[PDB]
Amino acid sequence: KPSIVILGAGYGGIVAALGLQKRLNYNEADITLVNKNDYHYITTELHQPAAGTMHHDQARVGIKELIDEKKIKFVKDTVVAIDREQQKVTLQNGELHYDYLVVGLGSEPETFGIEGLREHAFSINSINSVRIIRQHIEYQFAKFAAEPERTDYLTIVVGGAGFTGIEFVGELADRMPELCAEYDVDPKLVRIINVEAAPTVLPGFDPALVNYAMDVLGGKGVEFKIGTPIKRCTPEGVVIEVDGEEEEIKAATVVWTGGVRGNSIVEKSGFETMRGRIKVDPYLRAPGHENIFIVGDCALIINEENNRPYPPTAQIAIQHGENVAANLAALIRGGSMTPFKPHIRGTVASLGRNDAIGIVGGRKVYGHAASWLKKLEDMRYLYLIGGLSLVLK
Amino acid sequence: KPSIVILGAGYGGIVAALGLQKRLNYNEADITLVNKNDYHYITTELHQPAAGTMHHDQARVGIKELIDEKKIKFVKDTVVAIDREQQKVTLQNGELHYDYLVVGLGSEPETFGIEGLREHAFSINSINSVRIIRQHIEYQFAKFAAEPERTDYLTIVVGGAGFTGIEFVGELADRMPELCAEYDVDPKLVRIINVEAAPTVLPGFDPALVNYAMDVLGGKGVEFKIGTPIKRCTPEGVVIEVDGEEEEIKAATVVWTGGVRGNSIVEKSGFETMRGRIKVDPYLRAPGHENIFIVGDCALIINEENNRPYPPTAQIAIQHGENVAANLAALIRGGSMTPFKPHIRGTVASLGRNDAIGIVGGRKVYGHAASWLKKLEDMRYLYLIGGLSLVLK
Ligand SMILES: Cc1cc2nc3c(=O)[nH]c(=O)nc-3n(C[C@H](O)[C@H](O)[C@H](O)COP(=O)(O)OP(=O)(O)OC[C@H]3O[C@@H](n4cnc5c(N)ncnc54)[C@H](O)[C@@H]3O)c2cc1C
Ligand SMILES: Cc1cc2nc3c(=O)[nH]c(=O)nc-3n(C[C@H](O)[C@H](O)[C@H](O)COP(=O)(O)OP(=O)(O)OC[C@H]3O[C@@H](n4cnc5c(N)ncnc54)[C@H](O)[C@@H]3O)c2cc1C
């Protein structure tokens, strides 16, 4: 009984565990799955509960529900540290020893050292976090009617105009009429501001899609400030740099979607990391460790054709998990391992419940078609981990 | 030709207005109804939206929906002052001149000068105030899962154990299970604490009802501190006096149901007031103005028999409205009619969705009987102002 420990029941981890579960028969390996919570949250949907456009219970599933307690032992606790020499993982309430290790601890926010961002701005990275964002915004809107002078209650600043930020502002723009109606609020006073340091919205994207997104969101009232970095974050708003001079936006809500880095546990444990991530070998392993595998957002891979890194996505995390399960199963039975090859299909970014943009199959995809394609691809992961049973819920 | 101005579209005001509408045959009175908002809220229901057990729209009705624009002209503005000498009421956005004046501006909170109570505790007195309370609480619970050490997020202190405080804690007690389900909170950690300076819960009431209420609410986990004054209020809680010594409660939410005074506008306008209220003559008029009528909570009346002052209630306010409507109609048509005679029926205090207590007619009433009696009595008012249409909504 070799011991395989998987840290984090996110996309890569939960898929790795389920893969090992399907491939292996009882008493062949001792597998323990460690997670902060007893549920797995569907991270790619987290922007919707944050906005209030979807209930949060549709973005998570109970882990014990998914797995087999015989093949996999589930442990709900928080990983604190990793000791490679002792091959021991330190939790808040315990210790674990591993023969093989899988690290899938996801991302932490990258604030680029910007002042006050960690302390005063929100992140879309968990069920807890999006519930907090949602209730915070509803609270500010409730506060406005008693204090009509505080229009900063109705100002929401979204930092970063990448995939996440765009999806979020779209959800928000969809939500605004119902929210205003709910709190007796004048829609004309509401400001949703997306602030990006880069010269363009959605950098690295097809410019047609960017223009379409900017038109749709702008029509629904989103304001874009491009080429505008956030110099500072304060409890009453953000300070940005316009034309080389400081300007202030007074906003009761600031959400940071600007960047992600690998979870700090990986770097604190002495691994060599780039942006907190590990550039793994052909069999998704930490260099100079034949027993340590890295999946999801903790893993860095470079595209062969270009020379730019693959972005941290749920899709490639899923593929990471499948490959690691197959390779570990082979490794335990003394077989040989297959190298990892990413197979990246197109991805669609929603612009609300009804609209979206994407490049699918090399072809540009707008509107309801793109929206449905996204919904379908999302349904596939659900079928993958929980089957049609999960798909119905 | 004569102009009747009614200030405040609350119980007394809206009932006086609708009554005047029914009694007069148009074109005889110029009637203007002034309100802070474009809706009339059913104040006696406000404890439920505050807790979150009922949506706030069911606790208000559009004023324009209630009245006839031909007979009554509705003005949405905020009263700033009253000039008795010039017969002019000054608004934020206007001025009005009256031949007849009906004052029903309701109550304001009385904090008795307790430090921090005004700045840091919430009050149940409007649709805005209760939306703010509800969202504040939901926000604290949402914040809890991320910071489980902060149990004070789950502590709600309700100051004053009179009618309103009891109804409110009952509503909260009903609400806690769903709320806890919503934010992944362990119900055992939730503290609902009702703090009373008086030696008993529900002071001035029959002890049977008091004991039943404490038993029911105590059963749903509400905690009572009696004989306990509130020395101070801060953003993190309250300081109370126990056994003559200061003790601290760390609470993210403090709601004050401790006392009310007449709206300060009446006192500031040079009227002679007792605790901001006017002791009116037998035709509910302010001494010694023959053209000014006072309704609702702004009016103080003494019972002839018991020689005690009457409590500020919707029931007596409604009766005020009916009486001023009849008396003003008679006054216009030269009829010279009737003095005000209060006929006070029993009142029921709800203890949640399923339970309540009261002294109705002469009999103590508990449980489903009392609950239905209260619902029936409220529906009576709904029928009074809006008919079967309003009753169905
Ligand atoms: C709004 C938003 C929308 C997105 N949309 C898309 C999309 O459409 N397509 C796409 O490909 N990608 C999308 N992504 C990216 C995708 O969500 C991530 O790339 C993916 O979740 C990373 O997978 P992961 O398993 O590595 O990490 P995670 O999904 O974040 O899982 C990490 C797990 O480990 C737990 N955990 C974290 N730290 C600890 C710790 N110390 N101890 C114990 N447990 C811990 C966490 O609770 C969590 O369960 C989106 C991301 C966001 C925020
Ligand atoms: C939770 C709670 C529960 C209650 N339950 C009961 C019960 O069960 N039975 C009972 O008999 N009584 C009950 N009461 C008491 C009852 O609600 C009040 O006594 C009654 O509403 C007061 O009559 P009113 O019309 O003068 O005041 P209000 O109902 O408060 O109306 C005053 C109106 O004036 C408006 N207004 C105020 N100031 C201004 C301004 N400067 N300018 C313009 N407009 C203004 C306000 O918008 C409001 O519409 C309860 C009270 C509370 C807080």
Author numbering:
A (entry chain A), B (entry chain B): 3 to 395
What did the authors write?
Type-II NADH:quinone oxidoreductase (NADH dehydrogenase-2, NDH-2) is a membrane-bound dehydrogenase that oxidizes NADH and reduces quinones and is a central feature of the respiratory chain in many diverse species, but not in animals.
G164 is positioned next to the adenine-proximal ribose of the bound nucleotide and I379 is positioned at the entry to the quinone-binding pocket. On the other hand, I379E crystallized in the same space group as the WT and the side chain was observed in three of four molecules in the asymmetric unit. For the I379E variant, the KM for menadione increases significantly, to 780 μM, consistent with the mutation compromising quinone binding. Again, the observed rates are lower, with the maximal rate equivalent to ~60% of the WT rate, and, as expected, the apparent KM value for NADH has decreased. When oxidized I379E reacts with NADH, the flavin is reduced and a CTC forms, as in the WT enzyme.
